[PDB]
Design a protein around this ligand. Sequence first.
Ligand SMILES: *C(C1=C([O])C(Br)=C([O])C(Br)=[C]1)=[C@@]1(*)O(*)C2(*)(*)(*)(*)=[C]C([O])=C(*)(*)(*)[C@](*)(O(*)*)=C2(*)(*)C1(*)(*)(*)=[O@](*)(*)*
Ligand SMILES: *C1=C(*)([O])[C]=[C@@]2(*)O(*)[C@](*)(=C(*)C3=C([O])C(Br)=C([O])C(Br)=[C]3)C(*)(*)(*)(=O(*)*)C2(*)(*)(*)=C1(*)(*)O(*)*
Lengths: 115, 118, 118, 115
Amino acid sequence: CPLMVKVLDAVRGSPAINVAVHVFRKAADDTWEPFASGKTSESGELHGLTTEEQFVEGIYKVEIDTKSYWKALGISPFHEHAEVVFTANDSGPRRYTIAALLSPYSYSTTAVVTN
Amino acid sequence: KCPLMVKVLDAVRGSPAINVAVHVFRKAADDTWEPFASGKTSESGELHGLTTEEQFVEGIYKVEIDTKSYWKALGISPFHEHAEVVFTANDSGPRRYTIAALLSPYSYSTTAVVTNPK
Amino acid sequence: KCPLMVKVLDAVRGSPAINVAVHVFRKAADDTWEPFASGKTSESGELHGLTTEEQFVEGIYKVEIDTKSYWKALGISPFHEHAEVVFTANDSGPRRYTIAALLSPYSYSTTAVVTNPK
Amino acid sequence: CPLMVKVLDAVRGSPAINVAVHVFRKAADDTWEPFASGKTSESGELHGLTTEEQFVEGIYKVEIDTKSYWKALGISPFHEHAEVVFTANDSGPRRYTIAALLSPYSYSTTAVVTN
Ligand SMILES: *C(C1=C([O])C(Br)=C([O])C(Br)=[C]1)=[C@@]1(*)O(*)C2(*)(*)(*)(*)=[C]C([O])=C(*)(*)(*)[C@](*)(O(*)*)=C2(*)(*)C1(*)(*)(*)=[O@](*)(*)*
Ligand SMILES: *C1=C(*)([O])[C]=[C@@]2(*)O(*)[C@](*)(=C(*)C3=C([O])C(Br)=C([O])C(Br)=[C]3)C(*)(*)(*)(=O(*)*)C2(*)(*)(*)=C1(*)(*)O(*)*
């Protein structure tokens, strides 16, 4: 399993749980096509995602629905959503982890890439 | 302030990120992204002169920062293609938006500082 | 710029962190922390007027930001006691240091922007 | 095991491995006393640390030796080290995770606290 996501809440100092996360593979027409989606688990993680064989070289975009996460705590968010576009390249494609640490007006993001 | 300014910094190096291409869009009635403005950052890491209190109506705006180019430009292959900020501007009237991004090759952070013209 | 300024922002709320107690120390010959300067942040989130190009010799300086007080002051019990920045200043000659901290109750980030007087 | 640390490198998009991490319990005299220390593992984690029974209510300080981590990649750091002081209070003391994401001039930090 090469693609995991994690969401933290820097307001509660907990995992963000039930964050809708939608992945998109860029299509030839340089058009964003749905690839996989799921809801963050108990611990703020999502390993659903993909198959080693299905995750091929390309432009991928992880889109996190944060506004929703914020609204639901009855906090007013600045962002519409968080998104991260990266290239699944590297040597040949490996194991990614896309962490997002959130706040109403600020979010961070990181990739932890390991072989 | 101008209704919109961007501040880009380098966490690798300890300085403003100079000459970073930045691109602002607005969602069209259409659900399509319309070119609103563009600039490159200056010597202080800043980008002003973007829009006007007037031209800057309510809507969903998207700031795209060409992070990729900047890192490459300096010899490093960063993780990310860009950095995008998606937000709703002027729904409760005109505000002053200050979007800052702190960059590392595999990490970036963005904050918003919103304020009242008055 | 002054040789040292601090910029504190609120990520919860989308603004400068106003009236945040900040405390600067210097390690004494002694290995003991000596009171160098102190201020509270202003309306813009800033703190200037701290030292002087002259009073600000080489050394290890520690900036302590009273994060705890600020959050409590606004009804939230934050995780952290303070925020401390430990660094070596003016070893390759006088520089201009800009320390910023972006705060959340369970998270804080700090960046340094260093520059040449000339 | 109530206390874990994790260190990421936002320059390499990897875990920071072999980061000296030293914990300190505040003593009555409001003096910092050694409590536990260890080196970050393969994955940037450190679970050595403490025993549920030994980790009591109090002021704790995790001190990360980052300058060393940076020097060793032959990169010049701004910080002397990263430190985090917190109170092991809560309801009654629970499970902490102190993550630190680092860069030469910037570092972030977070607690993920769960029951
Ligand atoms: C803001 C600021 C940010 O927008 C972000 Br995303 C992070 O991570 C930090 Br830390 C700070 C300011 O930070 C600075 C730093 C300097 O040197 C000058 C400034 O004008 C600012 C900000 O406005
Ligand atoms: C558990 C936690 O409680 C925190 C963290 O933090 C990690 C990475 C990390 C990311 O991704 C960001 Br964007 C920031 O800002 C920081 Br600080 C730390 C983890 O992997 C992690 C776990 O597992």
